[PDB]
Amino acid sequence: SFSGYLKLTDNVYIKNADIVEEAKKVKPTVVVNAANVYLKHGGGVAGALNKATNNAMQVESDDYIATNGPLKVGGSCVLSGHNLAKHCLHVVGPNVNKGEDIQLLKSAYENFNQHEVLLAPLLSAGIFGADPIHSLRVCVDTVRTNVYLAVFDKNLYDKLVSSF
Numbered sequence: 001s002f003s004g005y006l007k008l009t010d011n012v013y014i015k016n017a018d019i020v021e022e023a024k025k026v027k028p029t030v031v032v033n034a035a036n037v038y039l040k041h042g043g044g045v046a047g048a049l050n051k052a053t054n055n056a057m058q059v060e061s062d063d064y065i066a067t068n069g070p071l072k073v074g075g076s077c078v079l080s081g082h083n084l085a086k087h088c089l090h091v092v093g094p095n096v097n098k099g100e101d102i103q104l105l106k107s108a109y110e111n112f113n114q115h116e117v118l119l120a121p122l123l124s125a126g127i128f129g130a131d132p133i134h135s136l137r138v139c140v141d142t143v144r145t146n147v148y149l150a151v152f153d154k155n156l157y158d159k160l161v162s163s164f
């Protein structure tokens with residue numbers, strides 16, 4: 001089970017951890033990927049999760065896109081979790097560096113409500129360009145299911161906890 005998390009609310013928990021290492025250790029039912037609409041897992045959380053699957057995530061994802069076309073910003077799809085989890089919920093938060101509407105971040109987090117418990121990163125944070133403090137607030141105010149947030153950067157983790 002999940003260990004070492006700091007409880008923020010009734011249903012939101014946080015830990016300074018690499019989501020890839022946390023997934024390999026816990027093997028949760030659902031790991032969230034910080035996906036883009038093409039499911040091109042090049043960098044950030046997506047590139048790291050895909051590398052941990054030996055590119056199997058990318059091969060599966062390319063087949064999914066060839067069949068279904070791209071996801072919507074704010075949307076998601078459930079695919080295999082490979083060696084990291086039972087399932088991977090690929091969720092597309094808005095990318096501020098591309099001018100995408102930050103209000104779509106709430107729609108992105110709503111996808112989490114379809115799963116009772118998830119291991120997740122902060123959506124739209126990191127290379128997606130949004131303020132992680134804002135992402136955490138939208139998460140707490142949107143997700144009602146049990147979410148275990150992994151934040152890689154220790155300095156940002158401390159700031160997220162201390163300003164909560």
Ligand SMILES: Cc1[nH]c2ncnc(NC(=O)[C@@H]3CCO[C@@H]3C)c2c1C
Pocket residue numbers: 017018019020044045048121122125126132150151152153156
């Ligand atoms: C490879 C990897 N693994 C992760 N596990 C959890 N969170 C992640 N992301 C961050 O911590 C961002 C860096 C700056 O602030 C963001 C919240 C990652 C990344 C990028």
